[model samples]
Target: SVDANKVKFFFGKNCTGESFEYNKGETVRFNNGDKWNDKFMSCLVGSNVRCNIWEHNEIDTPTPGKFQELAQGSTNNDLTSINGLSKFQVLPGAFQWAVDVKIVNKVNSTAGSYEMTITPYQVDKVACKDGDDFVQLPIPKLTPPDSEIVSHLTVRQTHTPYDYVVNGSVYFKYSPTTGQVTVIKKDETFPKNMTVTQDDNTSFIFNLNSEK
Candidate 1:
């Protein structure tokens, strides 16, 4: 319900460079026609709270057309910063998730099968498969809703100069009023009732794109 964690906005790439951490529960409107409309480039959001970003905004009410919601994440590739960054209530990813993953085949069996993959963002590796099973891992480091870093539920296999298979992603959104956490898989709304609190033991469950 309160500030879940510190959010850092960076003018540089990969959460680096000159950045400011939004700690208050308010919006920053670039007033006086300052023309600072699209300055921010990157961000590292905290647990349990979404951030509203704006490339173009008015001195008062932010136009919905130009506003975007950052459900959570660790990157920059969205809107042109945070000339108008607002703090909104949402869910926290501080706790680990029992991600439903299953990687049964080690080398895809077929010895002649091709093996090599590429991605735009870096992700913390995890071992996952499918058999109505799950893996315990810190899911936050993956991707968030519309986040620059695409979520990676990857599992490495035996191949030359190659590794991993991405099974897609699963993100969360909290309804502050309803206390219901919506599970978003890639873009589809996978809704559920799970509220993560400040305590460290309140973990939740989620699945990869294939399971959804």
Candidate 2:
């Protein structure tokens, strides 16, 4: 939330020349506010700053609505940031597929975007139409010739007990576009009982258990 009432400045080049002060947080709607040139620009939000673009607006404006203050006793704990912009994921089931991805510049500069693709993988549908029988499939081996990058997933614990049991299974995927390699667990969530100390480095090896 932002204090739209508190006046803020939009600056570029010469702070005094290109900058303009505005209130109502509608800085986006202020005159001569098109400093971003329809692209992203650095802006100050109170003391916490981040790079952001004015969505669907040609000019800078107050982020419509009053800023809501953080609730008391509220903790922004256990929040983790994605350190690497490029990454991969393999969901926790035979029905899922491994995904490898990378962030690449888009074709249009004004677009302010990135492109992704589904890298080819060898998949096995296990006695099914080569790809439908997920469990027996060679998995990635049957990944269709998808040239478009797909969205990836992240790891987070559910409400289950912290000591819940988690099983570990492994699989691999290779990105044809970025050529990045990824190894992941077939079971994304293992028993929470798996003791993971702050200093312990444990690894698991996976062996194929014949199809049911």
lDDT of 1 by residue, 10-61 (tens): 6766555676666623344443454544446766666554565433322223
lDDT of 2 by residue, 1-212 (tens): 33322323333321223433333212132223323332211222333211112122111134321111212112221111211111112122232233211221122222112111112233321111111211211132225423332222222123232231123333344333322234443235322222211110011112112111
TM-score of each: 0.32, 0.17
lDDT of 1: 0.38
Model 2 off-target regions past 4 Å? 1-7, 11-16, 25-42, 47-52, 57-212
Give each model's whole-structure lDDT: 0.38, 0.24
Mark the regions of model 1 whose C-alpha exceeds 4 Å error after superposition: 1-4, 31-34, 54-64, 81-212
Model 1 collision count: 10
